[PDB]
Amino acid sequence: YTRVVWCAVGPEEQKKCQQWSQQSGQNVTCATASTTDDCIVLVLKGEADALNLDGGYIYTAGKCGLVPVLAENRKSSKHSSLDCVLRPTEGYLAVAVVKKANEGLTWNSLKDKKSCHTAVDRTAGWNIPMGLIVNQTGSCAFDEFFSQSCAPGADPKSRLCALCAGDDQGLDKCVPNSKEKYYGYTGAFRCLAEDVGDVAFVKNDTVWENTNGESTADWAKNLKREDFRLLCLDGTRKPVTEAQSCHLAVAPNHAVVSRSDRAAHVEQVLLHQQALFGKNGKNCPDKFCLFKSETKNLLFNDNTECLAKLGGRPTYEEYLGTEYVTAIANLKKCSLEACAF
Numbered sequence: 090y091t092r093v094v095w096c097a098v099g100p101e102e103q104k105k106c107q108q109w110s111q112q113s114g115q116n117v118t119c120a121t122a123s124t125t126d127d128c129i130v131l132v133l134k135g136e137a138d139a140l141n142l143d144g145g146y147i148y149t150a151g152k153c154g155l156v157p158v159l160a161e162n163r164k165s166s167k168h169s170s171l172d173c174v175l176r177p178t179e180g181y182l183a184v185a186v187v188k189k190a191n192e193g194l195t196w197n198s199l200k201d202k203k204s205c206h207t208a209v210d211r212t213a214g215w216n217i218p219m220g221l222i223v224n225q226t227g228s229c230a231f232d233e234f235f236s237q238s239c240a241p242g243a244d245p246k247s248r249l250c251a252l253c254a255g256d257d258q259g260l261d262k263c264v265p266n267s268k269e270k271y272y273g274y275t276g277a278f279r280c281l282a283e284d285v286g287d288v289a290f291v292k293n294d295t296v297w298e299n300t301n302g303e304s305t306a307d308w309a310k311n312l313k314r315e316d317f318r319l320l321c322l323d324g325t326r327k328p329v330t331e332a333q334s335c336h337l338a339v340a341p342n343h344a345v346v347s348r349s350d351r352a353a354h355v356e357q358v359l360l361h362q363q364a365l366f367g368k369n370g371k372n373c374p375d376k377f378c379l380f381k382s383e384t385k386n387l388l389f390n391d392n393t394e395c396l397a398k399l400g401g402r403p404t405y406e407e408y409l410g411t412e413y414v415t416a417i418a419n420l421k422k423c424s425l426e427a428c429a430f
């Protein structure tokens with residue numbers, strides 16, 4: 090038992106982590122890096138213990154020997170009497186979203202159009218859709234498929250960063266942290282919402298949490314579901330209500346990882362942390378709520394009900410599942426057995 094050092098990605102996560110730190114009596118402390126990759130490195134080194142990660146990063150981290158510990162769990166309909174911490178995770182739907190007004194734009198006419206990605210190496214924003222495109226075009230030149238994009242994490246001076254905007258001042262353009270205006274699920278959807286891009290690769294949930302009054306953000310308060318369409322892989326367009334029948338894939342939930350030798354320890358502390366600041370926790374919303382950051386998805390997704398135990402002590406390949414791991418492998422041949430660091 091003891092203190093857990095969390096790794097925050099960028100200045101906004103840092104500010105929230107510090108709040109969490111103060112409220113916890115320093116039972117959790119904070120380290121900060123500029124990218125998710127740097128955070129993986131801090132954990133490897135032992136300078137940080139844990140962070141929450143999208144599936145695409147669970148993959149990077151796993152080659153380097155880090156393990157899944159607890160997974161994000163959101164509101165469910167199947168598997169009903171079980172307590173949240175013990176309910177199995179559902180996964181989320183990776184979808185491609187466009188404006189209704191942009192008529193005649195289908196999966197089969199995406200070439201040379203403008204795109205919005207959560208960030209390079211992420212599941213819904215990059216791995217799935219780009220894996221799909223490489224496989225469909227028989228080419229590895231996925232950097233030449235779209236005319237312009239905002240793909241946080243690519244080369245700032247490449248076309249994959251042409252549509253990114255940086256921070257309030259124009260700095261940090263295309264950085265894969267929340268300082269970049271078009272970063273993450275929310276940033277990518279905003280990129281489409283403001284007609285900077287033609288299509289956004291996000292998840293089912295993002296469309297719903299940022300339309301019809303669900304978000305009071307300047308850019309989203311007037312957004313309406315009917316104004317959006319999902320691009321299905323059979324060439325059709327469907328309303329956002331039909332995501333169960335019109336998605337690119339189902340993604341494994343974001344999860345907390347740590348070095349294997351710290352797993353038990355990290356797990357113990359966080360379960361107690363969530364009993365205090367989680368969905369129905371003792372001090373939320375009284376003093377501090379771990380799963381809220383006003384639609385910004387800082388440290389955790391805002392729609393998380395709880396962090397769930399992984400039943401069955403998964404390796405990272407089992408957590409991701411065989412379907413998703415094959416996809417990432419085949420796509421990374423474009424740009425076997427080794428840790429990136």
Ligand SMILES: *[C@@H]1O[C@H](CO)[C@@H](O[C@@H]2O[C@H](CO)[C@@H](O[C@H]3O[C@H](CO)[C@@H](O[C@@H]4O[C@H](CO)[C@@H](O[C@@H]5O[C@H](CO)[C@@H](O[C@H]6O[C@H](CO)[C@@H](O)[C@H](O)[C@@H]6O)[C@H](O)[C@@H]5O)[C@H](O)[C@@H]4O)[C@H](O)[C@@H]3O)[C@H](O)[C@H]2NC(C)=O)[C@H](O)[C@H]1NC(C)=O
Binds near residue numbers: 293
């Ligand atoms: C896309 O992403 C979005 C965003 O994440 C998802 O939208 C969210 O999804 C959740 C659920 O998935 C939404 O529901 C939330 O609000 C509920 C309303 O209070 C909360 O409680 C639930 O209510 C459900 C019904 O609304 C319950 O389900 C059942 O309802 C049946 C009614 O037909 C009922 O049937 C009985 O009673 C009937 C009377 O009408 C009889 O006719 C029948 O005979 C039968 O006896 C069942 O008993 C049962 O109640 C459910 O059990 C819950 O209690 C709850 O808090 C929940 O979270 C959420 O609002 C929504 N978010 C937003 C902002 O839209 C969406 O799901 C995603 N879609 C995909 C494809 O993944």
Ligand SMILES: *[C@@H]1O[C@H](CO)[C@@H](O[C@@H]2O[C@H](CO)[C@@H](O[C@H]3O[C@H](CO[C@@H]4O[C@H](CO)[C@@H](O)[C@H](O)[C@@H]4O)[C@@H](O[C@@H]4O[C@H](CO)[C@@H](O)[C@H](O)[C@@H]4O)[C@H](O)[C@@H]3O)[C@H](O)[C@H]2NC(C)=O)[C@H](O)[C@H]1NC(C)=O
Binds near residue numbers: 217221224412416419
């Ligand atoms: C890009 O193209 C790539 C090349 O095609 C894709 O990589 C391919 O991905 C495929 C699907 O993920 C893999 O094919 C699978 O083929 C068999 C079918 O899956 C099985 O289904 C049974 C249910 O009946 C399950 O029980 C079982 O677990 C499998 O999931 C699999 O063969 C099986 O082998 C067992 C014995 O081990 C046998 O008894 C079963 O009958 C069954 O036939 C096989 O293992 C695969 O799962 C391809 O392997 C994979 N190809 C390559 C070259 O990597 C890639 O996904 C494409 N990208 C996208 C985005 O789609």
Ligand SMILES: *[C@@H]1O[C@H](CO)[C@@H](O[C@@H]2O[C@H](CO)[C@@H](O)[C@H](O)[C@H]2NC(C)=O)[C@H](O)[C@H]1NC(C)=O
Binds near residue numbers: 361
């Ligand atoms: C610091 O962590 C410890 C361990 O969970 C907490 O102190 C515990 O308080 C609980 C009551 O919730 C007792 O049952 C345990 O005996 C205590 N453990 C120890 C090791 O003393 C405490 O809640 C945490 N403090 C903060 C700020 O979260």
Ligand SMILES: [Fe+3]
Binds near residue numbers: 343
């Ligand atoms: Fe994701």
Ligand SMILES: [Zn+2]
Binds near residue numbers: 336338339
């Ligand atoms: Zn499906």
Ligand SMILES: [Zn+2]
Binds near residue numbers: 401402403404407
């Ligand atoms: Zn196993």
